[PDB]
Design a protein around this nucleic acid. Sequence first.
RNA 1: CGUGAGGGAAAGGUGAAAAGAACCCCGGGAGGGGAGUGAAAUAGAGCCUGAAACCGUGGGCUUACAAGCAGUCACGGCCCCGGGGGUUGUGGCGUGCCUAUUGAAGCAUGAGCCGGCGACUCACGGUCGUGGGCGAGCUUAAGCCGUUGAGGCGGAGGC
RNA 2: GUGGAGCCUGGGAGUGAGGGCGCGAGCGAUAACGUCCGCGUCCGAGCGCGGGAACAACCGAGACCGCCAGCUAAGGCCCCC
RNA 3: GCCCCAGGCGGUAGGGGAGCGUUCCCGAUGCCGAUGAAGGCCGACCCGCGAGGGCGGCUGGAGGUAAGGGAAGUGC
Lengths: 112, 101, 140, 154, 59, 116
Amino acid sequence: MEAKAIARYVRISPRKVRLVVDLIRGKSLEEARNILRYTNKRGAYFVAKVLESAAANAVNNHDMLEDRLYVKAAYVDEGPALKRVLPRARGRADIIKKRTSHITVILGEKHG
Amino acid sequence: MFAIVKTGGKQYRVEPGLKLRVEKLDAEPGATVELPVLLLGGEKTVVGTPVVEGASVVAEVLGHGRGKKILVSKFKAKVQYRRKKGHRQPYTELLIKEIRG
Amino acid sequence: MKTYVPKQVEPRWVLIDAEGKTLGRLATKIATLLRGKHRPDWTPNVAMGDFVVVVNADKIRVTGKKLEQKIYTRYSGYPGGLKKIPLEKMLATHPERVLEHAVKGMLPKGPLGRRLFKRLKVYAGPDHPHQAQRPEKLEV
Amino acid sequence: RGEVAYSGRKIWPQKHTGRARHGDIGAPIFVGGGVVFGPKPRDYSYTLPKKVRKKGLAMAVADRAREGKLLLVEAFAGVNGKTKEFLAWAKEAGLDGSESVLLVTGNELVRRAARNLPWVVTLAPEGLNVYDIVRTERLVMDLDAWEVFQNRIG
Amino acid sequence: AKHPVPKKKTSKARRDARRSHHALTPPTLVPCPECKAMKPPHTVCPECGYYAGRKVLEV
Amino acid sequence: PRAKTGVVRRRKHKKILKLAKGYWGLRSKSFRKARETLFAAGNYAYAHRKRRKRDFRRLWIVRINAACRQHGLNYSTFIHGLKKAGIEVDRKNLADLAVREPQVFAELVERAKAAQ
RNA sequence: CGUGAGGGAAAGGUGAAAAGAACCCCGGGAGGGGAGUGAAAUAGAGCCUGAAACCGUGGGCUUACAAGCAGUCACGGCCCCGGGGGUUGUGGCGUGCCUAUUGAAGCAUGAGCCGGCGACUCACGGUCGUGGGCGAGCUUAAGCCGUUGAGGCGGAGGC
RNA sequence: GUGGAGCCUGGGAGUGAGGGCGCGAGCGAUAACGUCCGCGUCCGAGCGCGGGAACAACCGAGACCGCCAGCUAAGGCCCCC
RNA sequence: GCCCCAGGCGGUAGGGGAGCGUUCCCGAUGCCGAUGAAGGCCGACCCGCGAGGGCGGCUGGAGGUAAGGGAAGUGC
Ligand SMILES: [Mg+2]
Ligand SMILES: [Mg+2]
Ligand SMILES: [Mg+2]
Ligand SMILES: [Mg+2]
Ligand SMILES: [Mg+2]
Ligand SMILES: [Mg+2]
Ligand SMILES: [Mg+2]
Ligand SMILES: [Mg+2]
Ligand SMILES: [Mg+2]
Ligand SMILES: [Mg+2]
Ligand SMILES: [Mg+2]
Ligand SMILES: [Mg+2]
Ligand SMILES: [Mg+2]
Ligand SMILES: [Mg+2]
Ligand SMILES: [Mg+2]
Ligand SMILES: [Mg+2]
Ligand SMILES: [Mg+2]
Ligand SMILES: [Mg+2]
Ligand SMILES: [Mg+2]
Ligand SMILES: [Mg+2]
Ligand SMILES: [Mg+2]
Ligand SMILES: [Mg+2]
Ligand SMILES: [Mg+2]
Ligand SMILES: [Mg+2]
Ligand SMILES: [Mg+2]
Ligand SMILES: [Mg+2]
Ligand SMILES: [Mg+2]
Ligand SMILES: [Mg+2]
Ligand SMILES: [Mg+2]
Ligand SMILES: [Mg+2]
Ligand SMILES: [Mg+2]
Ligand SMILES: [Mg+2]
Ligand SMILES: [Mg+2]
Ligand SMILES: [Mg+2]
Ligand SMILES: [Mg+2]
Ligand SMILES: [Mg+2]
Ligand SMILES: [Mg+2]
Ligand SMILES: [Mg+2]
Ligand SMILES: [Mg+2]
Ligand SMILES: [Mg+2]
Ligand SMILES: [Mg+2]
Ligand SMILES: [Mg+2]
Ligand SMILES: [Mg+2]
Ligand SMILES: [Mg+2]
Ligand SMILES: [Mg+2]
Ligand SMILES: [Mg+2]
Ligand SMILES: [Mg+2]
Ligand SMILES: [Mg+2]
Ligand SMILES: [Mg+2]
Ligand SMILES: [Mg+2]
Ligand SMILES: [Mg+2]
Ligand SMILES: [Mg+2]
Ligand SMILES: [Mg+2]
Ligand SMILES: [Mg+2]
Ligand SMILES: [Mg+2]
Ligand SMILES: [Mg+2]
Ligand SMILES: [Mg+2]
Ligand SMILES: [Mg+2]
Ligand SMILES: [Mg+2]
Ligand SMILES: [Mg+2]
Ligand SMILES: [Mg+2]
Ligand SMILES: [Mg+2]
Ligand SMILES: [Mg+2]
Ligand SMILES: [Mg+2]
Ligand SMILES: [Mg+2]
Ligand SMILES: [Mg+2]
Ligand SMILES: [Mg+2]
Ligand SMILES: [Mg+2]
Ligand SMILES: [Mg+2]
Ligand SMILES: [Mg+2]
Ligand SMILES: [Mg+2]
Ligand SMILES: [Mg+2]
Ligand SMILES: [Mg+2]
Ligand SMILES: [Mg+2]
Ligand SMILES: [Mg+2]
Ligand SMILES: [Mg+2]
Ligand SMILES: [Mg+2]
Ligand SMILES: [Mg+2]
Ligand SMILES: [Mg+2]
Ligand SMILES: [Mg+2]
Ligand SMILES: [Mg+2]
Ligand SMILES: [Mg+2]
Ligand SMILES: [Mg+2]
Ligand SMILES: [Mg+2]
Ligand SMILES: [Mg+2]
Ligand SMILES: [Mg+2]
Ligand SMILES: [Mg+2]
Ligand SMILES: [Mg+2]
Ligand SMILES: [Mg+2]
Ligand SMILES: [Mg+2]
Ligand SMILES: [Mg+2]
Ligand SMILES: [Mg+2]
Ligand SMILES: [Mg+2]
Ligand SMILES: [Mg+2]
Ligand SMILES: [Mg+2]
Ligand SMILES: [Mg+2]
Ligand SMILES: [Mg+2]
Ligand SMILES: [Mg+2]
Ligand SMILES: [Mg+2]
Ligand SMILES: [Mg+2]
Ligand SMILES: [Mg+2]
Ligand SMILES: [Mg+2]
Ligand SMILES: [Mg+2]
Ligand SMILES: [Mg+2]
Ligand SMILES: [Mg+2]
Ligand SMILES: [Mg+2]
Ligand SMILES: [Mg+2]
Ligand SMILES: [Mg+2]
Ligand SMILES: [Mg+2]
Ligand SMILES: [Mg+2]
Ligand SMILES: [Mg+2]
Ligand SMILES: [Zn+2]
C-alpha cells in the first residue's frame, strides 16, 4: 500500500523546495521528520506539512503503520507563476516571476 | 562441405541448409536454381579458374521480398535543394540444398 | 554472408632487439605489430595487436646527421616554453623515448591508438621485466 | 489593413528601439490586423452560352430517357393536393420510393401533394434545369411540362 | 565597462552540471541523552531543556 | 472559406521530430534543430553507403595482405597471380577464406605463385 | 495609456443534471487524503479536448585520459520484445540552417525555444494557351418574367 | 554527323554585381587574390564525389537508387593511410 | 504486341509536368458514429519514390463525411 499527500499552489519557488524534498526522498518518516525540524530552509515548513498530511493519510485513511512509513517517492512540480512588475531604472519595468510549487510526498511501508 | 557461388554480381560462401538473401532472381517460389561455383571446400579443395568445371550448388527459392525501407535523402545548403526518396531494394531468398561437387 | 568479427583472444607477446637497427624502419614494423595488421583477422576498432617489447633502445641508430640535427620539441603552454631537445641529448638522458616517440607518432590518433601505444614496452639494455609473459623473439 | 479598426499611428519609431520596424497594428503581419487578399463580396454568376444551356437541358432528359427512366403522364389520377393521394398515384405508377424523382408538372396541387416527399423533387415546367435532372434517378413529366420542354429546346 | 552578456543560452546539460554542487546536506543531529530526542549537537535541547546533564532551559 | 493551419503543421513537425529521436539536446526536442540535424543525417547516410563499400574493401585487403605475408608474398603480387591464375574469387571471400579456411587459402597462394 | 485630441487590450466552454463533494482525517489557511455524487472527477470548478516548448519523479543503456555542426557507417557490449527496438564503447567519415554573394562553417544577415497569425489575390480589361458550344456567323447588357438556391425572356449593343 | 541537334511560330522566364585558372594584349611597376578586353575553361549552378594535408573554380571525374562484388582515373603503394 | 531492348535522369535564377495535404460546396432527407466522430498520444506493421494514406492500441465524448467533381483566407 502507498499513501500520498499533495500541497498545490504553495507560493515558494520549486527549485528551492526541491533542495529540501531531496533531503527526505527515501528517508524513514522518523528520519525525515528530524531532518526537516532542523533543515535551515523556508522549504522545510512546507515539505513538513506535506509529510505529516501524508503520514496522517496512511494511518487514518489507508491502514498503514506510522512506524513502517518511509518516503517512497517525492517531488516538487511547478505550478503557475505569480507575475509581478519590478520597476527598474530609466522607465524599464521587469517582470518578476514569483513562482509556485506542487509538493507531493508518497509514503510506502518498509516491510520487515 | 562448402562452396563459393556467384549470384547478382556478388560472391558468397555457401553450405547446405543455409538461408541467404541475394539479388532478385527470375525464378518462381518453390523452384530451384543452379548457381555457378567458383570454389569448393570442406574436403575436396577444388579451385575453379574462374568457375569449376561442372559442379554447381542447388538453391531452392524461398520467395521474394523487398528490403526494409532506406530513406535516401539529398540536401544542398544555401540552394534550397532537398530530396527525399524511399528505397526498398528487392531480394530473392534462397535455401541451398546440395553442392554438386 | 557477413564479414568475420573475431571474438577476443589473449594478446601475443613479442620481443624485438633494437640493436643496430634504423629508427624509422623499426618504428614501422612495431606499429604494424601494434595495430595487429600482421594478423589476417585484423579489426580496425579493437585492440588485438601484439604486445611489442623492445630492448637495447639505447643501441638504435640513425642515418645522416640526425644524431645532433634532429630536434625534438615540447610546448609547455607558457610564453617561450618551446623546448628543443636534439636527438643526441635525448638518447643521452632518456634514450627509450626516441623509439617510443617514433612508434607513437606512427600510431593512429584517437582512443585506440593511445591504448595501442600502451602495448609498447621500450627498454634500453638487453633486459626487460616481462618474463611472466613468454615473449617470442622476432627477427625484424 | 485599411478596413480594420485600428489607428494609423506608427507604433514605435523606425530605428533605435531594438524592435522590428512597424507602422500601424492594422498591418496584416499583426495578430488582429488586416487580411491579405482574403475573400470579398463576389459575384460567381456568369452567362453560360444559352445554346449550351439548351443542349444540356436536351441531353439531360435525353440521358434519363436512354436508361428507361423518363416517364410521361397524362394526369395524376386520385390526387387533389394530399400526400397520401400521391403515394397512391405513384405506387400505381411504378414509383415506389426506391428511386429519386424529378416530378415536373404545372399542376399546383400535384407539386403540393408530392413535395414533402424525401425522394421527390417538385418542379414547375418552366423550372426544368439540368442539375435537377441529374440529381434524381427518375424523371416524371406531365405532358404539358413535356410541352414547354420541347418548345424551349427548339 | 560595456555590458557583458551571455553569448549562448546554457544547455540543460550545462546548467544542471553547474548545480552538481547545490544538493543540501542533512543537518547533523545527535540523540539527547535525556529525552533521546534528535537535536543539533552542542545546542541546548529544545525539548527537555537539558544541556551538559543539567537543566538549562525551562521548556 | 478559411483554411486555417489546423493540425497540419503539428503533424509535420512530429514526423520530423520522430525521425530525430535520440538526438542530443534540442536536436531531438526543437523542430528547427531536428530538421537541421536530419539534413546532415541523410547526407551522411547516403555518402556513407557509398563509403561503406570502400571501407569493407579496405578491411578485406588488409586481412588478405596479412595472410599473404604469412606465405612469403604481398597482397599486390597475390592479386596479380590470381589475375593470371584465372581465379576470380572476390576479396569479401578471399578474406573470409584467409580466416576460416586458410588451407584453401594456402592453395590459392600456391596457384598465385605458379601463375607467374 | 495620454494634459488633451486621441489611442486602446486581454478575457468564451464542468456536467445530461450542481448531483458543485455532507461527514471524517492532516493542516492556521491553501492544499490534500478518505467518504460521497456522477457514465466519466487526470469532467472538481486553477473545471471539455489538453499538442509543443518548459520543469520534475521513477526505470533501461551510457559516461569522469576525453577533441565535439553532435551526425552518420561498421562492429561490439549491455537492456527490452518474441530477427527487431532502445542505448553507445571503439573505428571510419563529416565545415549547422537561412539570407546575401564572385566566394560563408564562416569571425557577413536573421533566428532563445515552442505554439498559433503570417506573404503572388480579386475586379475589370488585354494577350496567349486550352475545354466545350455554335459557326459566316457568335453573343447579348441593362432590365423584364418566373423560381425562392428553376430558370427563361430580353439583339440595345460587341466582336 | 538523328542530336535534350537545328529551324519556324507563339507562351513563360530569369539574367543584364561574376569570379578563378590557362593562353593573347592594354593599363599597372615584364606589382596585386590588381584592373580592362579577347579565346577557352571550370566555379557560379558540380561548397556533390577522388587527389592535392586542409582549400569554389589546380589534377581526376559529371552523383537516379541499392550491394559487405569487379576494373580503373588523378594521385599514390615505409607508418599515420 | 501488359512485357522486352536500349538510352537519358548534378543542378541555382527560371520554364514545364505530375501528385499529396488543408477549409468549404455538390454527392447528402444519404452514409459513418455512444459497440465511441473530430482531435490528441503511440506503433519497430501495411500501401506510396515522396508530400502522404491506412491499420492497430490508448486518450477523447459528438461529431465526421466516400467514390467523383467544384471553390479557396490552402501547407511557415
Ligand atoms: Mg527552501
Ligand atoms: Mg501520524
Ligand atoms: Mg520615472
Ligand atoms: Mg525571463
Ligand atoms: Mg525564474
Ligand atoms: Mg520565484
Ligand atoms: Mg540484399
Ligand atoms: Mg534484388
Ligand atoms: Mg546553410
Ligand atoms: Mg555545407
Ligand atoms: Mg551558393
Ligand atoms: Mg536547401
Ligand atoms: Mg531552387
Ligand atoms: Mg621564438
Ligand atoms: Mg493599415
Ligand atoms: Mg488606417
Ligand atoms: Mg478604433
Ligand atoms: Mg482604421
Ligand atoms: Mg499618419
Ligand atoms: Mg534583439
Ligand atoms: Mg505595421
Ligand atoms: Mg480581425
Ligand atoms: Mg473569374
Ligand atoms: Mg455576370
Ligand atoms: Mg422533396
Ligand atoms: Mg563607468
Ligand atoms: Mg546561457
Ligand atoms: Mg537532467
Ligand atoms: Mg536533474
Ligand atoms: Mg497559415
Ligand atoms: Mg568503388
Ligand atoms: Mg578461426
Ligand atoms: Mg496617469
Ligand atoms: Mg494622468
Ligand atoms: Mg452546457
Ligand atoms: Mg482544523
Ligand atoms: Mg478542506
Ligand atoms: Mg477533498
Ligand atoms: Mg457509483
Ligand atoms: Mg455509456
Ligand atoms: Mg469513456
Ligand atoms: Mg479525487
Ligand atoms: Mg483524461
Ligand atoms: Mg474528461
Ligand atoms: Mg484555490
Ligand atoms: Mg481552460
Ligand atoms: Mg461537450
Ligand atoms: Mg493539464
Ligand atoms: Mg506535456
Ligand atoms: Mg533521471
Ligand atoms: Mg595520455
Ligand atoms: Mg575511460
Ligand atoms: Mg566522448
Ligand atoms: Mg562516430
Ligand atoms: Mg547582404
Ligand atoms: Mg556583400
Ligand atoms: Mg559562429
Ligand atoms: Mg557585421
Ligand atoms: Mg556573425
Ligand atoms: Mg552567423
Ligand atoms: Mg548587408
Ligand atoms: Mg536571414
Ligand atoms: Mg529578443
Ligand atoms: Mg511556428
Ligand atoms: Mg499571379
Ligand atoms: Mg484577376
Ligand atoms: Mg486570361
Ligand atoms: Mg479563350
Ligand atoms: Mg462545330
Ligand atoms: Mg445567338
Ligand atoms: Mg537544350
Ligand atoms: Mg521563346
Ligand atoms: Mg536583372
Ligand atoms: Mg546594369
Ligand atoms: Mg555589368
Ligand atoms: Mg567589372
Ligand atoms: Mg562567364
Ligand atoms: Mg568581364
Ligand atoms: Mg577580381
Ligand atoms: Mg572567365
Ligand atoms: Mg602551360
Ligand atoms: Mg619586371
Ligand atoms: Mg594575373
Ligand atoms: Mg549568384
Ligand atoms: Mg556549371
Ligand atoms: Mg568542386
Ligand atoms: Mg558544369
Ligand atoms: Mg580533398
Ligand atoms: Mg571552402
Ligand atoms: Mg577538392
Ligand atoms: Mg550526372
Ligand atoms: Mg586489379
Ligand atoms: Mg597512374
Ligand atoms: Mg602521399
Ligand atoms: Mg599498410
Ligand atoms: Mg542535365
Ligand atoms: Mg534534375
Ligand atoms: Mg486536393
Ligand atoms: Mg469553418
Ligand atoms: Mg445536405
Ligand atoms: Mg429527415
Ligand atoms: Mg476502435
Ligand atoms: Mg474539420
Ligand atoms: Mg502516419
Ligand atoms: Mg484521398
Ligand atoms: Mg486511432
Ligand atoms: Mg481516435
Ligand atoms: Mg476527417
Ligand atoms: Mg462533407
Ligand atoms: Mg494567406
Ligand atoms: Mg507546412
Ligand atoms: Zn532532551
